Point group: D2
Chain length 455, copies 4
């Protein structure tokens, strides 16, 4: 729409597209921060709306906001949550480090929309004020950190954790099924003593179980909300019960154990909870990286690789099955590792009463949660559930290896066993061929003595 | 549009939305790689089209493609370049590590579109084939790396460099203007010997000039194109003149010094040129980080900070002017540092004949180029061009410092000078007050002897 | 020299040294840089050998004579008697096989002497057959890494963290009544007490402690008993739990046998995770150190709200210039921990099948970070934090110089009017009061009674 | 002990040591970890003092007697006579003030003895007044950093890089005729010669060399002469160029005076950049090392296309198990360089106003990376690369075992038919020929004449 609407702020009047619900400040920012393409994530946008919704409810309970104005704001917020205004937040991540502009973006959209809900119009003659009504008892300084933690905790709890548990269950099932399949071990990439495929996969399982616990230990710190500290953490200009009540309201509507941060100065001056929580994520990224690599190497082939297992072929060189799911997963794992550095740099750069590296920190954090959750979901349904062992290939490899000589020790002694091993290795023979060439035992004895199942 | 079109590939038939120009493979990928929100950058998409356009022209010149089919493909490519099909590439960055799926995405869109251009229809009865016609003489393996370098070089040359030069010119102008303004130096954050504001800004200037040269040194390696190496770099299934001709065509249509890579094995097996080029970028990120910080600290205030300079107030606590432009710039600088780690990890993970961490590498690389270019453009026009010195504040600071005592040495000796310095420091006085209290000189002599302009 | 030998033949080793043929061979094959195994890792490896000897003896696998000799030789390493006996570089075999053999040879040679025997090929104690009994480099090195890591965190890092926290806690309490100007985006903002600001530093350190403590249980899991590939082939069924108990006994740390030996050998997951908590602490310390040095900047042209002890001599003619050296040392080592994290992440992500072979590098970085953080906190504490003092005059001067206090006037005069004097003060370069009085909007008496900074 | 003193008073220093009061005071204030200044940096700092003495003498600022004594003392440091005289930790003042004083005191004390004088407060040469004449820690440390950096890259890193390149170049030439199976996404792909594959490694190293060479000119710029804040206050107008010339003369490296002293003191930009080229080299080496060890995996259940020298002894009963130890050492140090880059980036981005105070940490990481890469290439070269040999039988077995060769049949039989035998071979577990013959689509003679792998 070409038609503009004149809105204004302390700096003056500016044209805003008539069909949009934002105001003067959102428009100024839009024109001042034309940097790249990254905008606020939908999960962050919704957490911002949830925060405003909680503040409105509590402001009402304290008699700071009229029931009508408060219910209108609460209703406009629900529409945002319902995904009806996704097009109303055009601000880039690369804005003011406190996220002030996005806070104002939400204030204006909810003010203009709540006005209409009250039978009013959007624009300078609206019924609900962005600052006085929607931003009542708040500050960008304590609102953005609160929205960051709301989004972070819900994404970990609702997206990440469930997917982690599912993959764990799948691998655990595979572990039990392939428990009797003995295969050759590999240390340093060299042939080593045997182990069952099931024991090897149980390693992947335990890795995932351990990761779940570390992620869980990081949750309580993220559950601490900064809401109530206002500008510098002192809580100047708020009701003494506000902080506690707003945390309770949030916990109630989200069903997540949110609590008000015991120390508001720590809450506003740092992103510590997120720096630490992401530490657990880079840990999971390292574990997934290893699992994905094992999968693609074990499935490499079909003729000139390892080929011990087969994975589902998901897209259309006959046996050439590229491990695409493993490639997407390993790629996003590198991404999480980089995001950690950006997060650490931003987290270590706080100055005095406020850390102003927040949009970047939440941008990286929520991306890692999406990548990990979706990555595990994809890898699980398109690869993990269909992993199958190539029994013929596994057996062939076992029998062609020199690593089984050890079973001859108790029968013919170490020196003769080592001799057979040396002969086979020098002559390019199998242990059985070398053993028979030497005449140290019959084929029947070899077949009876070397049972890889007793490894 | 709910209506589907049945398309098919080696794996079978699949429904594709009737209103879209993609095919069966793009549809399968879409459904298999539902991971996060990152899709191919527009600059990468256009570079892919440019590559296909060059291959078509050359295939024609070699009599491998009919003039009509080749011109149709060339015309469809131009529409992509014109921005008419931005909605035709829905594939995530998190796909097959070779970028095979996006290569196929371009093949199908151009095949279906060129068909229509020839009076034909889109779908299984199209006139132009994705594989046989559009992907003629190519492989995803050598096409994606080529598209990566095309995008990379053009973004550096057309976006990054020009903005760097502009900021440099602005600071250079500011350097000359404030050449006579003496201010107090700061080492370790402590008051130090004086220097002009202009000398201090000249440091920023030289930093930018040096960065320009490093970025320039990285260009020739990025200019090397992999096109012609095909699957493993041997150039199997191509015309002996192909590689050279396709590089010449690209150079001609883009006006960039593109050359065919002397070693195709290095070109396909690694992202080395990009790992190195990004090294120069993380260097510029470090330099910009320092310049931005100096700017915000020097402008901190208005009463309780340093306040030596004033910057343009771009948005609507009277003198409270938040350095938002500096905050956006410092944030994106951390981002570039993280992108470097993700890039290094992907670049070091090649295996044998092909590196399969490409989409992630180009995703991070192009983001850093956008952030740096746009960041400098924004910082320059919304801050750098309006930097002004607070002469009164600067002078006040100079006169209140103990660092000017050194000018008394040649007149009254070191011991008396050091005595005055100690008195002022212990008693919280100014050098002049301490000097007069002691009676070592008159105010007229002090005013004549301590001339900060001769620092 | 002396002549020792192995399967590849003989090689001359300096007679005055206790290491053998394999250590000598490695010394010539891995001549990379100057980094060697740190003492804490050498001790952990010795402790691991000591525990293996006791258990092997208990299981009737080793003779009491040999077992006691091995433990005695091991106690001498812990006592610092053989530091010069471990010359191997960090940059060796990814499994730490070299260092495992270096310990086996040194321990076997010395254990021979202790038994009336001699060092060298005539020795009474066999490095492979005796000292390395029931073990493998694959499960021994990872065990040594966890022992060194858990003990370093418990005995060095945590105590120093607590101490620094107690110190900062005393300071916040002491300065609970000093009101100062707040700063957001580096700009003047609303007031807060110096004590409140310091309490933020305290809360940060307290949170970090619980974070570090959450990483300990995974690091306490030992690989010993997993043997070559994790199966435990060639070990007594009780070996794994017994050696874990023994180690817990002699170190007084809660070590346990890893529930899954495959995960224990194929990865360095516990350290990748534990190090996550450490880089988190590094980010926090960086912020604290920066606040301190910025607040102490000056003496005349900075912020100068606090003073810190001057530890280094200064120029006679330049009194007042006190460089925040401890802050510089701390910020530098913090950048180091961040880099160490990346190196560890890459190694931790690079395991293949049954064994991760990036171990010496991983432990090298991990132990360095613990060392840096522990000593860094101690130094910063004793040489800086304990001596943080406020420059009360400077703090008040800035407080009464800012326009931020105009908010108190709003409750006593219309927003626009209160803002009016603020505009004048700002534009004329006057203070809030001077502007208020000149504008005739109030008297000195009522102004002073309205603008109470101690009431936030 | 001996009693030395400074502005803060006196302090006892061990009599058998040449350092003074400030070094002794720092030794007690900066007790952090175990990292000290590396020899190359100590030498660079001595060289810097040597050059400053000659120039000061030439300008008539220092007496020939004192100037020559200072240079002689400096030559003794280069000769390794005083390594034990520099005990200061890396984790000190961000400007490297301590180490600058450590050198001044050691040099002054020794220069006194050299002049018939004595060490201690009775010395004839003053550390501050003489050895540090016309200088400042602010411009001396950055200069020492560049001297150490440029020389390390030129004398150690580059020669080793070239050598390793020449070796790999010989190998590719030698194996130019050995056809092997290609691998993309880890899957069997079209053929390429072993020599072509190795040529990729060569091209990578050659590109890295030009990249490293592009970073040298910026590192060659010296800060000496900028003095305290970059203005050059208290220096003779020709001092900066003269000392730069002197240094170029004695080191034989192309050092020049930094065009802009403000950029030189306020940043570590040249090293942040130069290190970018180094992490690039680290990424390349990582890939090369991984290819080598994967290609040599086995002996029976891996790829086994090549064999590499067995440098460490092995179990008698386990012949064939040759762990790629040099590859493990190289991959580990590569992860290290990546981490070092992050630490340097953080320090390089943290400068404030006139001086960057994250220097000791930056140079600590930079010199370590050069050290790791240089020694790493040497070790990998002599102990691995020179001995890379192909397992021709294994290579052919895999080649004739893959279905990838069916492409040659297409030109002699319809796509679908050629694909038909491929389907059967794959499904039945047969080879291309066995399937082709069993399907009766051709005879052994014509098959063998059509499938020529040596013709790509």
């Amino acid at each position: 729409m070409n038609t503009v609407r004149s809105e204004k702020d302390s700096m003056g009047a500016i044209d805003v597209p008539a069909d949009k619900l934002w105001g003067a400040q959102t428009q100024r920012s839009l024109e001042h921060f034309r940097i790249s393409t990254e905008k606020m994530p939908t999960s962050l946008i919704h957490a911002l709306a949830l925060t405003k919704r909680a503040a409105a409810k509590v402001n009402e309970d304290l008699g700071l906001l009229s029931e009508e104005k408060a219910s209108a704001i609460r209703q406009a917020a629900d529409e945002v949550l319902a995904g009806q205004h996704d097009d109303e937040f055009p601000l880039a991540i690369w804005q003011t480090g406190s996220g002030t502009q996005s806070n104002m973006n939400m204030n204006e959209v909810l003010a203009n929309r709540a006005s209409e809900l009250l039978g009013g119009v959007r624009g300078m003659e609206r019924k609900v004020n962005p600052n006085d009504d929607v931003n009542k008892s708040q500050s960008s300084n304590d609102v953005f950190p609160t929205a960051m933690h709301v989004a972070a905790l819900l994404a970990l709890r609702k997206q990440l954790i469930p997917q982690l548990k599912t993959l764990t269950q799948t691998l655990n099932e595979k572990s039990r099924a392939f428990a009797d399949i003995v295969k050759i071990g590999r240390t340093h990439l060299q042939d080593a003593t045997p182990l069952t495929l099931g024991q090897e996969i149980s390693g992947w399982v335990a890795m995932l179980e351990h990761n779940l616990k570390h992620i869980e230990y990081s949750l309580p710190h993220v559950a601490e909300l900064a809401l109530g500290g206002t500008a510098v953490g002192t809580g100047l200009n708020t009701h003494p019960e506000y902080a506690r009540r707003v945390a309770d309201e949030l916990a109630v509507i989200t069903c997540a154990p949110f609590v008000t941060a015991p120390n508001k100065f720590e809450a506003l001056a740092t992103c510590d909870a997120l720096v630490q929580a992401h530490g657990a994520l880079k840990g999971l990224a390292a574990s997934l990286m290893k699992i994905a690599n094992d999968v693609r190497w074990l499935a490499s082939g079909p003729r000139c690789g390892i080929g011990e297992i087969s994975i589902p072929e998901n897209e259309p060189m006959p046996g050439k099955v590229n491990p695409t799911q493993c490639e997407a997963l390993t790629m996003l794992c590198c991404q999480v590792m980089g995001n950690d550095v950006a997060i650490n740099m931003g987290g270590a750069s706080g100055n005095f009463e406020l850390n102003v590296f927040r949009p970047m920190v939440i941008h990286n954090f929520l991306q890692s949660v999406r990548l990990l959750a979706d990555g595990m979901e994809s890898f699980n349904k398109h690869c993990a559930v269909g992993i199958e062992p190539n029994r013929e290939r596994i057996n062939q490899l076992l029998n062609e290896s020199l690593m089984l000589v050890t079973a001859l020790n108790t029968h013919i002694g170490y020196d003769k066993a080592a001799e057979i091993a040396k002969k086979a290795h020098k002559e390019g023979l199998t242990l059985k061929a070398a053993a028979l060439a030497l005449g140290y035992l019959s084929e029947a004895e070899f077949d009876s003595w070397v049972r890889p199942e007793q490894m």
